[PDB]
């Protein structure tokens, strides 16, 4: 996350961190329920074996609430395309159920039509993660969040060197230097509606981080709500 603020105690409880064999985070996820994590399909290519950490806010110290879960089943969208990152979505079934507690709670899955007409028409959503704090920097040891405006689909298409499919949407700023970044991939984009937070996107890709004339590109979760439902069985 470039710019934004730390997640304070309790603020980003649906954040998950995918961690490699060296116990380093390489991608985010969103807690959907005690057994399921939502992430980006492209993240699965980034580590041969990986686990999921929840409850973590500071990767440099054990604040007691952190827990690592093994992944039992990886459910990757069969239409994921590395060349355009279309269908950039995966669900992970954990071997053991997550214990909800301070800093660990699921984000709500909304209903499709309501989400598209009412959530995605809000002014902003919130992206969070442990990703780089600038384009060429290192990952953040602190969980961060950032309010990002929803961006008109036309403007976003005009701004992009690469195709924006209907399974993607844009969020962020034209020139202000705030954006998700590398390492935030797979993480939550959620939208607040009356003090309840709903999953609206998955951090997917960008041409750099926070570049002028460029926006953050997210998987459009509302296009996959049936598929998510099915995947969680």
């Amino acid at each position: 996350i470039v710019g934004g603020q730390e997640c304070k105690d309790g603020e980003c409880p649906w954040q998950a961190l995918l961690i490699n064999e060296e116990n380093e985070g390489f991608c985010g996820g969103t807690i959907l329920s005690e057994f399921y994590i939502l992430t980006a399909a492209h993240c699965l290519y980034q580590a041969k074996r990986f686990k999921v950490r929840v409850g973590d806010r500071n990767t440099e110290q054990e604040e007691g609430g952190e827990a690592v879960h093994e992944v039992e089943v990886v459910i990757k969208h069969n239409r994921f395309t590395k060349e355009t990152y279309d269908f950039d979505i995966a669900v992970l079934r954990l071997k053991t159920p997550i214990t909800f507690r301070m800093n660990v709670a699921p984000a709500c899955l909304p209903e499709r039509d309501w989400a598209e007409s009412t959530l995605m028409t809000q002014k902003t959503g919130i992206v969070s993660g442990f990703g780089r704090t600038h384009e060429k920097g290192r990952q953040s040891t602190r969980l961060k969040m950032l309010e990002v405006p929803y961006v008109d689909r036309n403007s976003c298409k005009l701004s992009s060197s690469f195709i924006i499919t209907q399974n993607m949407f844009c969020a962020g700023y034209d020139t202000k230097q705030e954006d998700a970044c590398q390492g935030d991939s797979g993480g939550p984009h959620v939208t607040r509606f009356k003090d309840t937070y709903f999953v609206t996107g998955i951090v997917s890709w960008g041409e750099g981080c926070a570049r002028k004339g460029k926006y953050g590109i997210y998987t459009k979760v509302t296009a996959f709500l049936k598929w998510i439902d099915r995947s969680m069985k």
Binding site: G10, N103, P106, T118, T196, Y197
Partner: protein, 54 residues
């Protein structure tokens, strides 16, 4: 002009659907619709979408 679900979400806490010519409210899993048919009440600990306070 804004009517039904397009006017302040139909007064619903969460999901609003327009059925015949009227608002129908509903809630995410782990909540129950209140007696007034609009508010959503969490039915257990750690309901989805709530920042944690304990």
């Amino acid at each position: 002009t804004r009517k039904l679900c397009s006017l302040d979400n139909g007064d619903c806490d969460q999901f609003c659907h327009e059925e015949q010519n009227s608002v129908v409210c509903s809630c995410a899993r782990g909540y129950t619709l209140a007696d007034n048919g609009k508010a959503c009440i969490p039915t257990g600990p750690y309901p989805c979408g709530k920042q944690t306070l304990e």
